[PDB]
Structure formats: C-alpha cells, structure tokens
Amino acid sequence: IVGNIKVLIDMLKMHCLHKRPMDTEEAEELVRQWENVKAEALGPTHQVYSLSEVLDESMLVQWQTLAQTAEAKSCYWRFVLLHLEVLQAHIFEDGIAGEAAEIEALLEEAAELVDESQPKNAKYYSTYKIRYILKKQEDGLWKFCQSDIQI
Amino acid sequence: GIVGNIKVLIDMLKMHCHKRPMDTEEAEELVRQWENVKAEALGPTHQVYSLSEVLDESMLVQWQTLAQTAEAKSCYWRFVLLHLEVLQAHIFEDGIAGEAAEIEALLEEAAELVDESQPKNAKYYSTYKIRYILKKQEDGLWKFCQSDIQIQ
Ligand SMILES: [Mg+2]
Ligand SMILES: [Mg+2]
Numbered sequence: 001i002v003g004n005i006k007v008l009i010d011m012l013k014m015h016c017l018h019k020r021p022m023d024t025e026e027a028e029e030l031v032r033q034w035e036n037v038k039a040e041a042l043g044p045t046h047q048v049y050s051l052s053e054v055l056d057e058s059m060l061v062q063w064q065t066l067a068q069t070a071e072a073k074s075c076y077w078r079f080v081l082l083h084l085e086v087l088q089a090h091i092f093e094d095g096i097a098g099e100a101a102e103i104e105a106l107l108e109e110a111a112e113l114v115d116e117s118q119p120k121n122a123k124y125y126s127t128y129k130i131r132y133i134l135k136k137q138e139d140g141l142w143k144f145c146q147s148d149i150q151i
Numbered sequence: 152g153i154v155g156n157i158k159v160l161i162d163m164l165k166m167h168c169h170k171r172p173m174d175t176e177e178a179e180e181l182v183r184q185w186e187n188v189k190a191e192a193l194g195p196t197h198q199v200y201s202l203s204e205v206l207d208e209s210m211l212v213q214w215q216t217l218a219q220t221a222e223a224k225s226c227y228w229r230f231v232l233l234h235l236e237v238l239q240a241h242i243f244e245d246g247i248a249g250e251a252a253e254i255e256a257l258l259e260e261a262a263e264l265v266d267e268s269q270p271k272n273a274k275y276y277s278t279y280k281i282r283y284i285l286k287k288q289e290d291g292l293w294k295f296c297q298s299d300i301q302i303q
Binding site for chain 2: 029032033036039040043044045078079080081082110111112114119120121123125
C-alpha cells in the first residue's frame with residue numbers, strides 16, 4: 001500500500017494545527033538518504049537493518065518485507081537515482097504532542113533486477129511525483145512512515 | 152591508449168570521491184556478461200578477481216586498476232544498463248594460431264558513484280556506440296581485450 005513497492009514485488013515475481021514550512025535543503029537530504037538506503041537494502045549486500053534508521057510504521061514493515069524476500073531468493077536490484085526535486089515540504093503538529101511532516105518530491109530512477117540463473121536482467125525505469133509523511137521521533141530524527149504516488 | 156569508458160569514471164572518481172560472422176545473440180550474451188561483471192567489480196561487493204574471467208590484456212589491466220582504486224577510496228558505483236543493441240559482430244583469424252572477434256554495440260547506461268561522505272551522489276548517464284575486440288583463449292570462451300567508444 002505504500003508508494004511504488006507493488007511494482008518491485010511484481011518485478012520480483014515475473015523475474016527471479018500549526019503549519020510551518022520545512023527547509024528545502026533538509027527535506028532533500030532526507031529523501032536522498034532514504035533513496036540511498038533503499039538502494040542498499042535492496043542491493044547485493046542486502047542492508048536490511050539500515051531500513052529502520054530512516055523508516056518507521058508501514059514504510060518500514062513493507063520495505064523490510066520485500067528486502068528480506070529478495071535476500072531469501074538470492075536476487076538484488078541495482079538502483080540509480082537519476083533525478084530528485086523537492087516540490088513542497090511542511091512540518092505540522094497533528095493533535096499536537098509530536099511533530100509530523102510532509103514532503104512532495106519528483107523522482108526519476110532506474111533499476112536492474114539481477115538473478116544469476118538468468119543472464120538478461122529485468123529493467124525498471126520511472127519518473128514520478130510522490131508524497132511522503134514523516135514523524136519526528138523521540139531522538140529528534142525524522143522517519144518516513146507513509147508514502148503515496150500522485151497522478 | 153585508454154580503453155572504453157575508463158577516463159570518465161576516473162574523473163568522476165577524482166572529483167566526487169578470413170572473416171566469419173558471429174551470431175548476434177552470442178554477441179549479445181558476451182556484452183551482457185561483461186556489463187554484469189563490470190557492475191559487480193565496481194559495485195559495493197568489489198569483485199575485482201571476476202574481471203579476469205571476462206577480460207584480458209589492456210581491458211583487464213585498466214579495469215582492474217580502476218576497481219582497486221575505487222575500493223581504496225571506499226567508494227563504489229551502482230550501474231544500470233538501460234539499453235543494448237549489437238549492430239555488428241564477426242570473427243576473424245588473428246596471427247598464425249589465434250582467433251579474434253569484433254562486436255559493435257549501441258549502449259545506454261546510468262551510474263551513481265556512492266560516497267558515504269556526501270548526501271548527493273555524483274550521477275553519470277550516457278549513450279554511446281562502442282567497439283569491442285575479443286580474443287578466443289586457450290579454452291573455449293572469448294575475452295574482451297580492447298574497447299573503443301566511437302560515438303558520444
Ligand atoms: Mg520511495
Ligand atoms: Mg563498457
């Protein structure tokens with residue numbers, strides 16, 4: 001149900017109310033960090049633990065599952081982030097207590113699914129607009145908890 | 152002098168860290184195998200020895216050197232091969248005893264140089280026509296020896 005992960009599961013099957021603006025540079029650093037963690041969790045060293053550094057809630061559970069099954073089937077992706085543009089970022093307090101944030105980003109990425117039985121790799125490419133929900137943790141760090149693809 | 156794409160990879164590493172036709176599908180397999188070994192030798196697992204399995208002569212020496220350098224700097228690349236077309240391939244006799252082949256291919260790839268130090272990764276994207284010269288070894292299979300990027 002989180003954004004984009006259905007495409008990668010399919011690929012794995014057929015192959016192998018106070019609003020405040022958020023700093024655009026910071027919002028971009030969070031996404032970039034996430035993208036690079038996704039690449040490594042899904043990559044040949046299968047760094048699954050790192051997912052829990054940048055993710056929480058449904059994001060974590062779902063991306064953790066797909067990473068583990070891939071490590072189980074001895075497949076991995078090579079991921080390249082072609083383009084990243086942060087469209088909007090806003091912090092807010094829902095029911096006060098802890099803060100939440102939202103980030104709309106424009107992403108362009110490519111990937112190869114590598115299965116050793118098969119010398120021809122499956123290929124993935126996409127450009128998309130995505131909306132992220134984040135929650136500031138007790139440590140004061142942001143983690144992505146939900147994601148939604150847009151039109 | 153330099154083989155294939157080597158120069159560009161070194162710079163982004165520096166800044167941001169008589170004659171018979173060959174069956175085209177044989178040629179397609181051989182380029183895909185090499186492009187796979189390159190991504191694994193230059194990737195996070197740093198499989199340098201594996202270069203010796205598909206490469207020889209100047210290819211092997213130059214690509215091995217690049218892969219050992221990236222590892223020495225604790226940087227790695229993620230490569231994605233986006234499009235591959237063999238335009239032409241053929242075998243020819245080389246020397247008193249030896250066999251060689253030429254493969255001409257259109258390639259499109261993308262790559263990301265990963266450095267733990269900075270959040271942004273340098274991003275490489277290219278489309279090119281390349282020419283490979285391979286040499287059949289004492290065993291059965293071919294190995295890439297030289298490669299020239301002719302267009303873009
Ligand atoms: Mg995502
Ligand atoms: Mg090449």
